[PDB]
């Protein structure tokens, strides 16, 4: 029961720069008979299975670009991505195969691109007529192609601020331009949606000098 530990939890590195991930085993993985470290690394892109990158601590799997490098010995190991590309954004796992079953992994380390600040483009969608005839109304606010991930969304109904009737989710970092997008949905009853008239989505972000509001009426 070797426990695998990883550090850090998250990593943001500029494009072309070096990312360094660490992995610790609760006991040595080296095995003195040969001099081989029984340790592997896996890259898991969002929505994909893990892909094997390194094994025996430093043997690079076939087809893996040489910017990926592994090193370390015994209980301490490192995965280095020397010239970080946008496609390398993923969670990276280490795995021991020294004390056979079980196979055990580390907790992973997320690698993301560090990038110039990008202000979000903002769009607001009123509920469809397909939804209003069904007794609920969903107004969606889109925060598109911004960086970094931190953004605040505030809904206002008739210039009254809302709290606890919206929900949002964020895309993982875009594999090309390294930006994020965010989608917030405020959900009201058809009754309460019709009691009011103006619907505002207010957006705050590092890249905006003042907040951005997008609104409609009806």
């Amino acid at each position: 029961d070797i426990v695998m530990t990883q550090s850090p939890d998250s990593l943001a590195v500029s494009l072309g720069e070096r990312a360094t991930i660490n992995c610790k085993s609760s006991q040595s993985v080296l095995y003195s008979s040969n001099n081989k470290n029984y340790l592997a690394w896996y890259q898991q892109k969002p929505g994909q299975p893990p892909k094997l990158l390194i094994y025996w601590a430093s043997t690079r799997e076939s087809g893996v670009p040489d910017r990926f490098s592994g090193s370390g010995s015994g209980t301490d190991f490192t995965l280095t991505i020397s010239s970080l590309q946008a496609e390398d954004v993923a969670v990276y796992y280490c795995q021991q195969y020294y004390r056979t079953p079980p196979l055990t992994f580390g907790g992973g380390t997320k690698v993301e691109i560090k990038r110039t600040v990008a202000a979000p483009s903002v769009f607001i969608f009123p509920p469809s007529d397909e939804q209003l005839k069904s007794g609920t109304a969903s107004v969606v606010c889109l925060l598109n192609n911004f960086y970094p991930r931190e953004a605040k969304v505030q809904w206002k109904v008739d210039n009254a601020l809302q709290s606890g009737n919206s929900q949002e989710s964020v895309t993982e970092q875009d594999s090309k331009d390294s930006t994020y997008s965010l989608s917030s949905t405020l959900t009201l009853s058809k009754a309460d949606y019709e009691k009011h008239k103006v619907y505002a989505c207010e957006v705050t972000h590092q890249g905006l000098s003042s907040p951005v509001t997008k609104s409609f009426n009806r």
Binding site: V140, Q167, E168, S181, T185, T187
Partner: peptide, 19 residues
């Protein structure tokens, strides 16, 4: 295109959006 992770609403059902 952006397809967002589904959100789990209070109802116990999921809702996502794509743009």
């Amino acid at each position: 295109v952006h397809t967002f992770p589904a959100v789990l609403q209070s109802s116990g059902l999921y809702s996502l959006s794509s743009v």
